[PDB]
Write a protein that binds this ligand. Structure first.
Ligand SMILES: [Zn+2]
Ligand SMILES: [Zn+2]
Length: 72
């Protein structure tokens, strides 16, 4: 199977890219601290293991000052 489709080129801020996904974004959740762009799942996932920013490495104490147990 091919299932191959693509062909899009534009000129805009190269920041759109994700420091994690290293590609396109989905939710486009911007931080209110360092003002960085990170996919909801990305920033949310990174906050699960590390309460810091995978960009500047800052302990963003916005979501919650508590780590919390392993309750799904
Ligand atoms: Zn991402
Ligand atoms: Zn940051």
């Amino acid at each position: 199977g091919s299932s191959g489709s693509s062909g899009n080129l534009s000129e805009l801020t190269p920041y759109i890219l994700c420091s994690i996904c290293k590609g396109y974004l989905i939710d486009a959740t911007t931080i209110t601290e360092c003002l960085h762009t990170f996919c909801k799942s990305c920033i949310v996932r990174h906050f699960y293991y590390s309460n810091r920013c995978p960009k500047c490495n800052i302990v963003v104490h916005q979501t919650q000052p508590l780590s919390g147990p392993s309750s799904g």
